[PDB]
Write an enzyme that holds these catalytic residues in place. Structure first.
Site, PDB file in Angstrom:
ATOM      1  N   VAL I  46       0.880  -1.206   0.000  1.00 48.68           N
ATOM      2  CA  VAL I  46       0.000   0.000   0.000  1.00 48.68           C
ATOM      3  C   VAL I  46       0.903   1.238   0.000  1.00 48.68           C
ATOM      4  O   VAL I  46       1.770   1.328   0.893  1.00 48.68           O
ATOM      5  CB  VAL I  46      -0.943  -0.008   1.219  1.00 48.68           C
ATOM      6  CG1 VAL I  46      -1.817   1.242   1.275  1.00 48.68           C
ATOM      7  CG2 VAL I  46      -1.804  -1.265   1.250  1.00 48.68           C
ATOM      8  N   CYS I  47       0.712   2.158  -0.951  1.00 48.13           N
ATOM      9  CA  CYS I  47       1.470   3.441  -1.023  1.00 48.13           C
ATOM     10  C   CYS I  47       1.214   4.244   0.254  1.00 48.13           C
ATOM     11  O   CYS I  47       0.071   4.459   0.623  1.00 48.13           O
ATOM     12  CB  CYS I  47       1.090   4.263  -2.252  1.00 48.13           C
ATOM     13  SG  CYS I  47       2.315   5.550  -2.615  1.00 48.13           S
TER      14      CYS I  47
END
Lengths: 162, 163, 163, 163, 163, 163, 163, 163, 163, 162
Positions: I46-47
């Site tokens: 997940v960024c």
């Protein structure tokens, strides 16, 4: 919750030393390292190399401020007869350190090595000068305790504390 | 409530007959009388008169349909080593009857003779053919128990259970 | 847990001595050995040898610093009627030591010998000078109590407690 | 809640009748009225007129379909010795009705008359043909029980239950 | 545990005396004997001779230092209407002693005479000068209570407590 | 939780109707409305208009399918004596509806009107044909209850339950 | 146990009075009689004559030392919107007495009128100058409350407490 | 333990939709996203922007398969009076989605937003098609709820639940 | 009960500011506003937009008297290693604010965001100068949280606490 | 009561193997010996010689029907980043055996090595083919685990069981 890292449960018990009976208190040994070990029972047919090896090499532990204590649940009287029985006929021969009688099974229960059969498992604990347990080795079966490895782990603990 | 008059608490434990190990069970003695006795510890400086005198006269007990059983809280290996030591240097020599190993201390407990120290008092129970305890002698201190007296009590018991 | 080797439960009870009612407290016998025995019931058709033998031989016990107390669950009045019945007509006759009324059954219960029938078993306890039980003989059935054997166990307890 | 008005507590006990031991069950007297009385102890120096007055007049109860049962906490053996002692020397003489041994004290307790001293109070209870308690008289102290007044109440219960 | 032999449960309750309402405390009769009796209900069809016989003979009790109290579970108002009904029409007529109202049923309960129907049995209690219960009579039905027998029992208790 | 809105607690109790004793069960009035009221005691000095006003106007309730029941904690016998006392002398005179005896105090308790003095408050309950409580009025003192207001409330409830 | 006869449960709550929010404490009305009434909900299609009849006649209560408090489980804000709605469109119009918000439902619960639906039943309660509950009227259903009958009871409590 | 990521507590409640009373069950919205929001009280002096904004923009939510439900602890009748009050005179006006009565406070309690004052906090919950809470915004104080921000979080939840 | 409105649960935990370890304590922030946010795990795919965008605009938060604090259940050594990884290959780069190590999971627990899996949900609380939680945003899934929106809410909160 | 001599508490957890995520179940390894060890935490400044030594010598354990399992309470994601970090910059380098994520602390709690600080102590357990624990070594401090001694005790157990 874990016995390793915690303060060593204290005890008062009968022991044989220099073939005489005396009272031992674990906390009387503060200021010194202790190697406390448990074996099941006296007078078995298993060769007692786990007890005698430390007796023959006892000097190496005195010379680095370590006492050694052996424990089973046999009486002071059973220990003494086993010590006065020769190695050739299934005994121990003279013994350089105390052999503790855990007759009420309170020391085996406190250190977590008492089985349901009324005997301790094979187990060793190294206790520091301030009475803290820094190591535990516990064995379900009879094979080698290496005295070389016991002494290595003990010198490793001395090094890290000074 | 009282132990005497009640059925004998049963036990499955290791023992030593004829210098071999065997599991023994009290209840597998029903139809014989049992002299069940307890003593503190193996390999003490107390002379083992109580144990050896029963051995030396075991003939007399075999002969009036009676078994003898000693018990302490010591291991079965300790019992073998004390049996295999000559009387002259602190031992029992050959024992005419099973020597039971109360290693878990559960027999002593169930017979009310376990002390705070973890060893049994000196005690003798007589158990009849049906398993019911008819007699108990319990001693705090060491003093030559009379085998003559034990045997008298076993016969008085035997006499009353055929009348 | 064991009665033997613990301090004897104290008790304060009515008894009959020299044909009069007296309050007996076990702990007032500290300084003296006590042979305390229990029997089931007064005025049974069993010969009371276990009580007359101790009477005839009381001198042997007093000469070694030893009181004797018999105990049943019967009343003090029952005791006195049994003492004042001759041996010929089923009684005790003159008795040389106190006979104790355990009328609430508190004594029989605390010595471990009260049956579910409401009577005591046949039981004997030797108690040393400092009030500790050293010995217990308990019988389900009526035979001889050997006063020779009691005296033996008593004198062995006396010899051991000097040396 | 109250004992009077409710089904009499049943008991199985030893009793003395015609100088012999037998088992009494209170419920085997259904069909008959029962006068059940309690007194403290056998062989006391209180004159036993509470027992002997009923015996001497026992035909008068028998002829109105009534049994008399006396109860104390003494044994069957004490009851027999008391019956076999002459009135002149502190006995009962021959007794016409059963004397019940409350040796466990369970009957005294169930009828609310057991004291902390392990004996019953003086109590009388009239139980009817169906085993219901119709009357209770309970006394802390010793004085004359009027047999005439016991019989007045008995016959008043008979008369009321006839109608 | 038995009510007879123990200190009478005290009460503070409304009563009718001399056709007026007053508060009666049992413990304020210490120094006098008390005949406390219980009857089920006012205004029934059972003739009230158990109440009126004591009224008509009250002077005999007063002359031997004894108060009489009657108790039922009815209100003080029911008591006063009954006292003020003539004997011919079902009532008591004047009453010479207090009639206590046990409206909360606490006095019936404490003396062990409250039934499951919310009424007391017929019950009579003699309480001494120190407030201890020495006697109880308790009837399940109207058999007739004898004032003569009550009076004989009371004088026996007074005689015993001076000797 | 509130009594009003829930099924009326049922009761089975003794009552006086037409100068006779009968057993009244509330649930046997299902199909009719019930005015159940509670008053403290019979035979007080408070004029009983709260009871007699309903007697004198009973026909108005009967003509709209409604039973009237009065309850106090007094016995059926106290009720009958009060009903049979003339109004001039303190009583009710004939009563046209049942007067229920709450002798165990269970009905007062279940309807929430039992006080700590063992009497009910003045209370009135309208219960419909299915046995549900639709109304309660409860007074701490004798303020006067209006039969007209009771009757208006009852007809309002009957009007609402048909529309 | 019963609410009527006991000290009115005190409450601290928001109320609407003269179209403004204020805190009402029931105990600050000691010295005055309180008529406290409960109704279910604001803004229903039931005509609010139970609230408006008291408002329109409020001088009649004020001149006999009486406050009127109406209660429901709605908020202070709902009460204000209802007061500011004209009678013609389903409102109250100007209200002469406080309207109390039982937003937590604690007042409904303490006065025994809270239903499982989270609203109160119709209830009225008269509380006296010392804060004791003298009267309760509780209704399951909706019909005319007679203001005349509320005032009759109020003045009857005033008259009884003047004497 | 967390509300968010668990299945939304189901509820069955009265609401107002298109100016009529309707039973709403949250689980009947399965197949649709639900924006469920809580506000404290109807008819406050706070502008109800958090409720009118969702009304004016309802189309934006219906076009992405999304119902909206507002919830307060006020009654359904309170809701309808607030809906039928114009925005000009302090009200909601015509409302495009159901407004729910949480009159027992069961909904506010089960979503974690019931204060000890008896009102809900300002709270918003987004619930997906399978009835699981994906999002929760809870505010102590009144400011903007951005309908832009709700729509953003909703559409991001919709995009994530395809891919 | 609810977390929002209540005083913020305090915590003593390890953190990472300026690429060094320091114990931080929430309450040692009283007189600043705190944005306390939680995220599942360090080093995911997940960024980390939520964490980095707050860093990049931290200036704006410093400038309106606000601190930022991120928390996960990861160790303080994990936090340092993620900070010391460049954004380009999956890391945070230099972080303008403390990153708290909830290693015992006790902070997540006390804020109601710990899941059965042993990690926190995505959650943001705003804590005011006095320590009281005024706002909570809790998300089940990953979607770009608006820093614009968080900041709007912090200012609305700030605006209302100076009026 | 003692963990040594008893059946090994089973577990299902995330692990990293060949740099991918998978589910591990201890009882899937029955028929094989297991050396299960615990270390406190990933990304510390303590040299990870206790993990890497077994990785470099992994072949000697495969060749005698032993699997090796390392456990700390860090996430699957923390393990993977530590494995892709070079030895030169405080990492692990490639790793020949599974590294288990005890994220809920249930495995550390079950084996008795969880401290109050939220991390396991240093500890090793050898588990037989039938899933019985025949050995435990537990250390309060960081010194040498000897791989030579671990392998000796393991060959001693194989010998005694056949």
């Amino acid at each position: 919750k874990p016995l390793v890292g915690s303060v060593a449960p204290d005890f008062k018990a009968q022991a044989v030393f220099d073939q005489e009976f005396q009272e031992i208190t674990l906390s009387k040994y503060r200021g010194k390292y202790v190697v406390l070990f448990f074996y099941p029972l006296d007078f078995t047919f298993v060769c007692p190399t786990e007890i005698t090896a430390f007796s023959d090499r006892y000097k190496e532990f005195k010379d680095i401020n370590t006492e050694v204590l052996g424990v089973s649940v046999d009486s002071q009287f059973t220990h003494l007869a086993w010590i006065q029985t020769d190695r050739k006929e299934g005994g121990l021969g003279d013994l350089a350190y105390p052999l503790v009688a855990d007759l009420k099974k309170e020391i085996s229960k406190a250190y977590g090595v008492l089985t349901e059969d009324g005997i301790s498992l094979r187990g060793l604990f190294i206790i520091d000068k301030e009475g803290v347990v820094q190591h535990a080795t516990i064995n379900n079966l009879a094979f080698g305790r290496s005295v070389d490895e016991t002494k290595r782990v003990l010198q490793a603990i001395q090094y890290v504390q000074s």
